[PDB]
Amino acid sequence: MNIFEMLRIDEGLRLKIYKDTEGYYTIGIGHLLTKSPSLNAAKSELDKAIGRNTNGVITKDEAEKLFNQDVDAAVRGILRNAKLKPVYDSLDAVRRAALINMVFQMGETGVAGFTNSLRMLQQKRWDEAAVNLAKSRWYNQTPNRAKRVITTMRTGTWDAYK
Ligand SMILES: [Cl-]
Ligand SMILES: [Cl-]
């Protein structure tokens, strides 16, 4: 299992613009298009992102390209972040995948905001971090996916995904 396969499980794959859990216009593999209520602002963003007139639909390939850019951006964001970088450096390979997952879903700013949990992770206090991470809107809004991520963080194995 790797970060790509992990995220592909968590986000799914959709070739047509759709609304995410929060109601935002998304496409492909968890690629947020816009927080604007306009399906037209979404189509516009989509066309800009793809470099062609899509009329709200893309191919597998296109979705995969967005996905590759997104994980890359996710990783570079972590490494550029003064709050996140140290945590990441301190982690093993599995846990790193878990933080990348969170960052992809909630943005760098968002994760950087979980001050307490980041401190616990850095101290390798796994169980406690797991407990604190669950006290969040994130967890309450998307409980099954959050539990999977949190389990990966607590254990350092890919069990939740197998
Ligand atoms: Cl883009
Ligand atoms: Cl969920």
TL;DR of this structure?
The PDB classes it as hydrolase(o-glycosyl). The chain has 162 residues and is mainly alpha-helical.
Give an overview of the whole structure:
The structure is a monomer. The chain is mainly α. The protein has a single domain, classed as Lysozyme, CATH 1.10.530.40. Helices cover 64% and strands 9% of the residues. A three-stranded antiparallel beta sheet has the order 1-2-3. The termini are close together. 30% of the residues are buried. It binds chloride ion (2 copies). It catalyses: Hydrolysis of (1->4)-beta-linkages between N-acetylmuramic acid and N-acetyl-D-glucosamine residues in a peptidoglycan and between N-acetyl-D-glucosamine residues in chitodextrins. It is an enzyme of class 3 (hydrolase). Belongs to the glycosyl hydrolase 24 family. Its main location: host cell.
Radius of gyration: 16 Å
Major β-sheet strand ordering: 1-2-3
Give the termini distance in whole angstroms.
9 Å
Q: Under CATH, the topology is which?
A: Lysozyme
CATH class: Mainly Alpha
Shape: elongated
What share of residues are in beta strands? 5-15%
Structural class: mainly alpha
CATH architecture, please?
Orthogonal Bundle
State the order of secondary-structure elements, H for helix, E for strand.
HEEEHHHHHHHH
Number of domains as seen in the coordinates: 1
Helix content: 55-70%
The hetero molecules present are: chloride ion
Number of strands: 3
Instruction: Characterize the largest beta sheet: strand count, sense, and whether it forms a barrel.
Output: 3 strands, antiparallel
> Total number of helical segments?
9
